[PDB]
Amino acid sequence: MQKYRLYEKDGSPVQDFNRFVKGWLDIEFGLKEHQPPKVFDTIRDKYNEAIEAVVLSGVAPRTAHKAALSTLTELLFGHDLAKELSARLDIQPIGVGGFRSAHSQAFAKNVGENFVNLMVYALACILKDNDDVLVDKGLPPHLKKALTLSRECRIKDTLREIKIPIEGDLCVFSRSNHCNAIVISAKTRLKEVFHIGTMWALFSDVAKDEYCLNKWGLKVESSESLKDTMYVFATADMISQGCDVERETPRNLIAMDASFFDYVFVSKMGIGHVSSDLSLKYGRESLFHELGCIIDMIEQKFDILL
Amino acid sequence: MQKYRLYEKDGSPVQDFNRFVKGWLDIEFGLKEHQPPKVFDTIRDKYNEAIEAVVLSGVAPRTAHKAALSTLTELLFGHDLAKELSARLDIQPIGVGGFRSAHSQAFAKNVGENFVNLMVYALACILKDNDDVLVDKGLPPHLKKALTLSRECRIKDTLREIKIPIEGDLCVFSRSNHCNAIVISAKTRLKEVFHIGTMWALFSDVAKDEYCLNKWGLKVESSESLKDTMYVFATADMISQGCDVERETPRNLIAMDASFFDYVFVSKMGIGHVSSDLSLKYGRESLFHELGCIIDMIEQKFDILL
């Protein structure tokens, strides 16, 4: 299998970036920076078949991807996504199928990574004709080092340099500025693990504030650069006591976790408290947005049209 | 079963506090603020039998409790604690026994709460003749409200007041000042859940800093009062890939989590990087201290002798 590289040895992203990314998830070729996706073939095709079905019904491609993103939880459950998108967009009642492979152990053991893969693919598809705004699973080299804090802690006699690598599952960033990015953390569920994200959500705030850098004795490569670095969370709310996002009002601890993120997206639609509108100008509408609103977020932030 | 109350209706702790606490764990009587301990009877007796055995060997009571605290992980595994304390203190090789009940499902389902119970009991025993410095499972009412942050977040039309209750599993506090306390978070293991503690460890810092209060739009009852509020973590390192604390050098993410706590105690002894000395005057010796050092921490902080 032929393998290419997304980034040059300096860290610069190769031209027509979103092409190599989409090809990697299409398994048209492997990549240097990434291992081939696992049991992603079926759900990737089921996604595209839904987009093809909706688009051929006069619906704009942007409208399709944005609607599919806000309904990815269905595709992850192996349900007929196109039957879902059609009902919402009120076009001709479509059937693409759904897939038994969803109920397999291999799929259930890779659903977490496939959720990340679905978002990367959906974004790569809509950004395929754009080489200014890029998308990649995980963080680009330059941003991963910029989001890495440092700390020196006393271990008896000697001193231990401690690294604080603020994580991200996927990233939408600018070619001319890798810090001008949207870092996305993704989990299929929230539960109490959401607190872990809040810690990272706080550190991303901390890394931008020279006062906070000093209070906790932290060293960052450049705090001013991270000014344009947005830090968000994306969840499928896949779920017992029920769900965490899909309810009349989210629980207090869940609400507080989402509040310290810049934005929190969910791949569900029709939830009362969840905002379907996203305007960077007028501020965060609610604690939870529909995942499709990330398109609007990308458009406004990077000043492009999809 | 007769039930008493640790706190009056105003919030003031009843006189001879540590007596009612020790009695509750002795199940001499129930309490209003606490439900009776579960499957704690066996391990509580096995603890005392070890202290009785060591003390009757000329060893001072303070020396016993401090050594037992730094070896609680053994008592939680159902091992012969007195055979362990004797070997360390180099007195007459003792046998108290150990207990089969450790390998029971009921004990395994309550080991997490019993770990908290063991620490509360051990501290209650050593503080039984002190009515100035108190110990209680969880936080006292006045401190629980003082450690509760507040935040207003926009939910579309309306505004949602969000509570941020900085948690604690047990607390050692002053009667004349409940904020002058040692808040202790306790888990039998660290793993990735330790990040959750780091979030709380950060919020405790945040709650003390009027700048940080304002940056994140947070309201606290009194930030100045929490100045004397110490926030620590206690773990049994009970453990595969091995342990997290019991190794030559703890993993990076584990180290960074411990670093944002004021102190981190472990109920193990003989670990190279773990400090057996604790001096508030000369600062935190290492990221991990022996749990027995919390006695020294209590003594120095509250200016008492045990």
Numbering used by the authors:
A (entry chain A), B (entry chain A): 1 to 239, 246 to 312
From the paper:
PfoI belongs to the CCGG-family and cleaves the 7 bp sequence 5′-T|CCNGGA ("|" designates cleavage position). The overall fold of PfoI monomer represents a typical PD…D/ExK nuclease fold with the structural core made of central four-stranded β-sheet surrounded by α-helices (50–52). The PfoI monomer is composed of an N-terminal α-helical subdomain (residues 1-131, colored pink-yellow and blue-green in Figure 1B and C) and the C-terminal subdomain (residues 132–312) that bears PD…D/ExK core (colored orange and cyan in Figure 1B and C). Structures and mutagenesis indicate that PfoI features a permuted E…ExD…K active site that differs from the consensus motif characteristic to other family members.
